[PDB]
Design an enzyme around this catalytic site. Sequence first.
Site, PDB file in Angstrom:
ATOM      1  N   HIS C  41       0.816  -1.215   0.000  1.00 43.31           N
ATOM      2  CA  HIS C  41       0.000   0.000   0.000  1.00 43.31           C
ATOM      3  C   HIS C  41       0.850   1.265   0.000  1.00 43.31           C
ATOM      4  O   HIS C  41       0.367   2.343  -0.349  1.00 43.31           O
ATOM      5  CB  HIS C  41      -0.949   0.015   1.205  1.00 43.31           C
ATOM      6  CG  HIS C  41      -0.253  -0.033   2.531  1.00 43.31           C
ATOM      7  ND1 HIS C  41      -0.053  -1.209   3.219  1.00 43.31           N
ATOM      8  CD2 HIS C  41       0.276   0.948   3.301  1.00 43.31           C
ATOM      9  CE1 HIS C  41       0.578  -0.953   4.351  1.00 43.31           C
ATOM     10  NE2 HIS C  41       0.792   0.348   4.422  1.00 43.31           N
ATOM     11  N   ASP C  90      -0.831  -7.769   1.073  1.00 42.58           N
ATOM     12  CA  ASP C  90      -0.085  -6.530   1.242  1.00 42.58           C
ATOM     13  C   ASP C  90       1.392  -6.799   1.515  1.00 42.58           C
ATOM     14  O   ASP C  90       1.839  -6.772   2.662  1.00 42.58           O
ATOM     15  CB  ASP C  90      -0.690  -5.705   2.377  1.00 42.58           C
ATOM     16  CG  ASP C  90      -0.035  -4.350   2.523  1.00 42.58           C
ATOM     17  OD1 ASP C  90       0.546  -3.856   1.536  1.00 42.58           O
ATOM     18  OD2 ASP C  90      -0.110  -3.770   3.626  1.00 42.58           O
ATOM     19  N   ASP C 179       0.556  -0.366  20.141  1.00 40.72           N
ATOM     20  CA  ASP C 179       0.221  -0.801  18.788  1.00 40.72           C
ATOM     21  C   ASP C 179       1.085  -0.102  17.741  1.00 40.72           C
ATOM     22  O   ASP C 179       1.576   1.004  17.967  1.00 40.72           O
ATOM     23  CB  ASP C 179      -1.259  -0.533  18.494  1.00 40.72           C
ATOM     24  CG  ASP C 179      -1.721  -1.151  17.186  1.00 40.72           C
ATOM     25  OD1 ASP C 179      -1.053  -2.087  16.696  1.00 40.72           O
ATOM     26  OD2 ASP C 179      -2.760  -0.705  16.653  1.00 40.72           O
ATOM     27  N   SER C 185       4.076   1.068   8.502  1.00 41.36           N
ATOM     28  CA  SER C 185       3.734   0.091   7.473  1.00 41.36           C
ATOM     29  C   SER C 185       4.970  -0.326   6.682  1.00 41.36           C
ATOM     30  O   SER C 185       5.739   0.520   6.231  1.00 41.36           O
ATOM     31  CB  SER C 185       2.666   0.674   6.543  1.00 41.36           C
ATOM     32  OG  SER C 185       2.371   2.000   6.935  1.00 41.36           O
ATOM     33  N   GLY C 186       5.161  -1.635   6.536  1.00 35.61           N
ATOM     34  CA  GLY C 186       6.315  -2.173   5.836  1.00 35.61           C
ATOM     35  C   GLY C 186       7.414  -2.621   6.781  1.00 35.61           C
ATOM     36  O   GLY C 186       8.326  -3.344   6.383  1.00 35.61           O
TER      37      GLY C 186
END
Lengths: 198, 141, 247
Positions: C41, C90, C179, C185-186
């Site tokens: 994404h 993803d 969290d 992301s990634g």
Amino acid sequence: TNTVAAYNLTWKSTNFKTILEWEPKPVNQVYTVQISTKSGDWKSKCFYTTDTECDLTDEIVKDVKQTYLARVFSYPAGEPLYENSPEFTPYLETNLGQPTIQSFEQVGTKVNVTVEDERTLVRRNNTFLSLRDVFGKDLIYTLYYWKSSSSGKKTAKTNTNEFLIDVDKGENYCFSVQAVIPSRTVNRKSTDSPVECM
Amino acid sequence: ANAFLEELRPGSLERECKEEQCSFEEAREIFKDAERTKLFWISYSDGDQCASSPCQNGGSCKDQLQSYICFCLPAFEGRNCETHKDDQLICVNENGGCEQYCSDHKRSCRCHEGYSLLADGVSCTPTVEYPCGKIPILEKR
Amino acid sequence: IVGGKVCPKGECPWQVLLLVNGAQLCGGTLINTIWVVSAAHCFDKIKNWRNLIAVLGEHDLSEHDGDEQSRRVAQVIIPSTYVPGTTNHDIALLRLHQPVVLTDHVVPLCLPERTFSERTLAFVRFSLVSGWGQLLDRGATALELMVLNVPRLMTQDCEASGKITEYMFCAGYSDGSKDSCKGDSGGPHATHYRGTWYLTGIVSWGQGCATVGHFGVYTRVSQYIEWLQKLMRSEPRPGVLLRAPFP
Ligand SMILES: *[C@@H]1O[C@H](CO)[C@@H](O)[C@H](O)[C@H]1O
Ligand SMILES: *[C@@H]1O[C@@H](C)[C@@H](O)[C@@H](O)[C@@H]1O
Ligand SMILES: C[As](C)(=O)[O-]
Ligand SMILES: C[As](C)(=O)[O-]
Ligand SMILES: [Ca+2]
Ligand SMILES: [Ca+2]
Ligand SMILES: [Ca+2]
Ligand SMILES: [Ca+2]
Ligand SMILES: [Ca+2]
Ligand SMILES: [Ca+2]
Ligand SMILES: [Ca+2]
Ligand SMILES: [Ca+2]
């Protein structure tokens, strides 16, 4: 489908001899059981067994104070189907085994009643530890004694495994001890021991 | 039990119910009081489950209420000590003891690139200077 | 990363920083001297595929201590099954134009075998997640590399909330405190087992950072072991983006 989730996951524990049981019997499938602590890794037991039970004793005796959670997987024969068991804290939920009056001895107007120490499955020091080596001050024994000519039953209690009670001279008495842990809302008392008369 | 002129003697729990097999009527003769007699018959009727010798591989049994418990030897486990620890060496069981990769067939262990399998056939060790999945500033000096 | 701690310099040697036009884009994971794993994404809005840079050995974004190693991203590879705007599949495999030099601050994370990752690593409870993402839901990014420890949940338990597929898994806390978040992301979801760390997940998506009654979702790397290893033995196409068939 090719698999069905297990159910009726119940804990059967006596003197820390813990057995997990579930249903149903396998049809075109096999079971695998996992167990862990609150923050511990999942360890597998009974790999691809057709049994509807699994002995988890060796896993829970490592620390009976810890709360344990287990689950039963179902493999046919992305993740496989499974079911969680209720949480289980051995030290607080294991059933107290049936005690046994080791011996009794009278000396005049008093009688001593000794209880045999109940061996548990906790194999510390390469030998099974007794029931008192685990609970200590939490464990007590309750004595039920009475005459053949008595209306009701008298009661005594000890922090050790020996009762020092008084008796009526000449009278014949009977006895029956019971393991107890007052610091328990569930599984508070054991079953009554075999009777032993003078 | 009732043998020739046995009932001439005063009843005793030891000789009649423990040493022999007493009936409810023989038990009533000793306890007299019915309410206490019934309470005894419940526990007395529950026999010794260890009479069948369910435990195995040199395990010791202990009678319980409508059940039993088997004290297994160290290399054994199960309700009746039927399971052997050694006969479970597979990748599902603690990675088959392998430090890294495992394979079923005796199970064979293997190592990721950059590592190599030792003589013990389970342990891996870095062959390169900077192996993957390790922190140099924590494995030096 | 929400409710995490600063990862000490050198204790996360596989963490990659991906940039576009000098701007912070996403995190990544070094698995060897040439290849880097990331989320798909992150590459949805890219225009200047030539201005794609991967930094390694980074820690503090506001300073340059000389341990950083920059490389141009020669080729970004994603599954054909992946669809921009969705969560499924993803994952992205990046080819650095030139291999990086492994140092005390630059070390790859082991890419495990499928069976090993499914049988053993999947059942190690806690794993590490890290990145320079937001410190709070709808907040500012981090300057120093943050790290967080989180427990893994099986999909049956996480579905107490079919939104989670077999190519995903949940991890974190439903108490709303710890969290992963936007910008992470990634990044790597690394699992320890006997003195060795392995890649088992990729920071993918979630329903709000550290939201009560929800966990962070991660791409199940064990599904793409064969797929990744296949591409790492392939001849590079001239185009930067490359939608490879999966499986
Ligand atoms: C006699 O043995 C059987 C199995 O061998 C067991 O199930 C019984 O409980 C025991 O008394
Ligand atoms: C009873 O306990 C088990 C553990 C073994 O030691 C047996 O030999 C013994 O009789
Ligand atoms: C205690 As540390 C984060 O320096 O390994
Ligand atoms: C990421 As969820 C579906 O467990 O709230
Ligand atoms: Ca007789
Ligand atoms: Ca008789
Ligand atoms: Ca006798
Ligand atoms: Ca006799
Ligand atoms: Ca009689
Ligand atoms: Ca009679
Ligand atoms: Ca019995
Ligand atoms: Ca820097």
